[PDB]
From a paper:
One well conserved pathway that it shares with other bacterial pathogens is for fatty-acid biosynthesis as a primary source of cell-membrane lipids. In [name] fatty-acid biosynthesis occurs via the type II fatty-acid synthase pathway, which is thought to be descendant from an algal plastid and consists of four to eight individual enzymes that start with acetyl coenzyme A and malonyl-(acyl-carrier-protein) to create elongated fatty acids for the lipid bilayer. Thus, unlike other members of the short-chain dehydrogenase/reductase superfamily, [name] undergoes a substantial conformational change upon cofactor binding that organizes the active-site triad (Ser143, Tyr156 and Arg160) and alters the affinity of the other substrate-binding sites in the tetrameric enzyme. While a number of antimicrobial options have been identified for targeting most of the enzymes in the FAS II pathway, [name] is still relatively unaddressed, in part owing to the conformational change that it undergoes.
The SSGCID has solved a 2.25 Å resolution structure of [name] [name], a 3-ketoacyl-(acyl-carrier-protein) reductase, which corresponds well to the solved structures for other notable bacterial pathogens while differing from mammalian analogs. For Rickettsia in particular this is a significant target for drug development as the organism has a minimal proteome with very few essential biosynthetic pathways maintained. The structure of [name] [name] is very similar to those reported for E. coli [name] and other bacterial FabGs; the protomer assumes a Rossmann-fold structure with a seven β-­stranded twisted parallel β-sheet flanked by four α-helices on either side and two βαβαβ motifs at the core. [name] [name] crystallizes with two protomers per asymmetric unit. A tetramer is generated by crystallographic symmetry. For FabGs tetramers are typically observed. It is therefore assumed that [name] [name] is in a tetrameric state. Based on these high overall correspondences in sequence and secondary and tertiary structure, conclusions drawn from the other bacterial structures may also be applicable to the Rickettsia protein. Owing to a significant conformational change during substrate binding, it has been difficult to identify suitable inhibitors for this essential and highly conserved enzyme.
Author numbering:
A (entry chain A), D (entry chain A): 1 to 85, 99 to 138, 141 to 182, 189 to 241
B (entry chain B), C (entry chain B): 1 to 87, 99 to 139, 141 to 241
Write the structure that this text describes.
């Protein structure tokens, strides 16, 4: 069903366990992958596992010009995956960086009348969690819907994946897992799976949606 | 990725555009498909096109004993897809919501034993639109509420319960509309274009997969951005 | 601010804790109150406490002709408050959703002429919780969907349609629960405390006001933060 | 029903038409009002209309220390009303300023185990509108829910009012009003009314909610 052959995807925060699960899956589905992030050493070990059809981009999203530059550095771009990511610090990383990445990617994707943007919110935390992470996640979803409407006639979809708890002392766990009906934490591959679907041609009529991958913890 | 080899899926409403698209896709992905519905000739043609790995089940949702009989008479049911019986308030509530609750309850009866299942409820297509007649709107919201509550309650027993909510899906060569009507609907849709049945089918397949395991009680909107949840 | 002088309000379920709290508040604010329900003695006591500006309407929601008869038999109806008949899937769907649709349709019949109305649908209280049994969950989601669709359709004709969704409301001297049960429910509620009927009544009064004119098709959750929409 | 006698409320952006409608209403309901904002001249003309039981605080929210200072300057505070308010500019004004105001107000309100915080999102724009306003509005609501959960046992409620279109060429209007079932724009008094309710004792069991005052334009 899901074939990403011929596509080029860019994954930010590609050395996190979610970032890397996404990178492997999209690569395994035939996408050429641009794995981006600040830890060159970890990106390279990801790269080694990928073997070919990837490129590393050592990048600090915290810097606005570097977000802006990251996308230009790329010629083909069909799929952008923005991983997460002081109130100000979380907002600037989880929301302002992502705006730039999304906007710049849109400018590129408009030229082809094709593209996929998937914004991934950080892992809970934390029912609604700390104000900063909760504000930035919501903000990112509001951002996603808004850009979705804006690029809709031009063949670009913009969607969000909201992971719940992805893999403490036995007290802290009890606490969380009790908020997850399924009764367990998710794994990075659970998020990767949702992302690959939204990044594919089989989700061409899905835009502005947030897809929660959370074990029933939040039902929307 | 979405390999349904050795699985059995039951699709109600299998003769509608969405229904038959779901039937073919789930079959293409390796699943036996119990293709169910009221028009038998329509259902035989689909069957004929499917060729193998199906069973027809002529069936009338309206009959409450016949919904309950539908699920108990299938043996290994891994995946249930309830299509909407929808284009009287009581009537549409009865087919789109009550009917679907027997199907859902009866499927969980079978699935809880096997500790594995997928239930996927599909709301009725948006009409000529988005809030709709009260009765369709009620049943649809209702379906989605039902889907959350069943999701919660089987969530520890390896069954996911999810819904798909299509927008304006074009199933037919002609939609029966004139240009003004058409423009009026297409103005509701950011993508500036209709859904087709395969759009909904792809979403259903995604949820039906083994890898959709951590995804439950969600509504996947396939609607060209006309409604963002 | 919320002056209901010269208005008439009909409250179904007027003998429940929430119902009678709504009845007293809307009366206190100057509205005649058509206090309706099935237990007459309960309803007479409330009436006795109300003293003036009410009418009792013994009535059985279950009867579809009796819901329709309820609204047509009241003359100047400005405000309708439908309380939930809720503590069979079919049954709860029939009282909490179908019943409420006749009431709502029949009220809009009267209100559209006067080009002014308030309709306020109240979902059933959360049970011992939040997603609930499927049947209550379905009807509640369903009610809220109905409320949006009717809201849209009378929105140009000076009628607002809104819902109130309470959480755990304590109405009775004792709740029937033991401490473990109580702690389990109170753990669901950020405020760490129960709703009381007046909480829901205040929300209803807010929506019923002349100044709630631009507010329609909303669900006002009065639930101590247990669910945030 | 709604009596604010004995209370002190602080309204930011108090010289906007929404801000001032809120200030008058809360004052008319018996609240002492602290009317805050950057336009001293306009605040003073608001002040004159109020006549007594108010105080002006000339304040630029754009400055973080000034947000932090605004609340300390106040001894009694039962009710805070945060009016809205470069991607970065809108986020910083409509979301970062509000965080500080909310957090500082919470520190004060914890001491009394009482308080009301109402965050008001900017007027549409714009179905979801520009990405910056849509992101900041969503962010503010996510922020509101998160702080709601955090202060809930301490007698403070935190809620959001989301106005729709509040009072172009005849083309632009046609466009908007078509998105509003009611078929008309709202007035500032419509927002003021919602705020007074949430700010009162009659909304003591309502927290973490967003209340949309929009003519049915968005139903939630």
């Amino acid at each position: 069903m899901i074939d990403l052959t011929g596509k080029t995807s860019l994954i930010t925060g590609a050395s996190s366990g979610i970032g890397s699960a996404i990178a492997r899956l999209l690569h395994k589905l035939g996408s050429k992958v641009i794995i981006s992030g600040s830890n060159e050493e970890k990106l390279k070990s990801l790269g080694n596992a990928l073997k070919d059809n990837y490129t590393i981009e050592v990048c600090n999203l915290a810097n606005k010009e570097e977000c802006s530059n990251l996308i230009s550095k790329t010629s083909n771009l069909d799929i952008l995956v923005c991983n997460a990511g002081d109130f100000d610090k979380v907002i600037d990383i989880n929301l302002k960086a992502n705006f730039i990445l999304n906007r710049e990617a849109i400018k590129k994707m408009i030229q082809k009348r094709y593209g996929r943007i998937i914004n991934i919110s950080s892992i809970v935390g934390g029912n609604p969690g700390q104000a900063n992470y909760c504000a930035s996640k919501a903000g990112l979803i509001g951002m996603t819907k808004s850009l979705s409407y804006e690029v809709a006639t031009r063949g670009i979809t913009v969607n969000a994946v909201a992971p719940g708890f992805i893999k403490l002392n036995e007290k802290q766990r009890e606490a969380i897992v009790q908020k997850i009906p399924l009764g367990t934490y998710g794994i990075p591959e659970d998020v990767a799976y949702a992302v690959a679907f939204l990044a594919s041609n089989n989700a061409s009529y899905i835009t502005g949606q947030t897809l929660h991958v959370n074990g029933g913890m939040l039902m929307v």
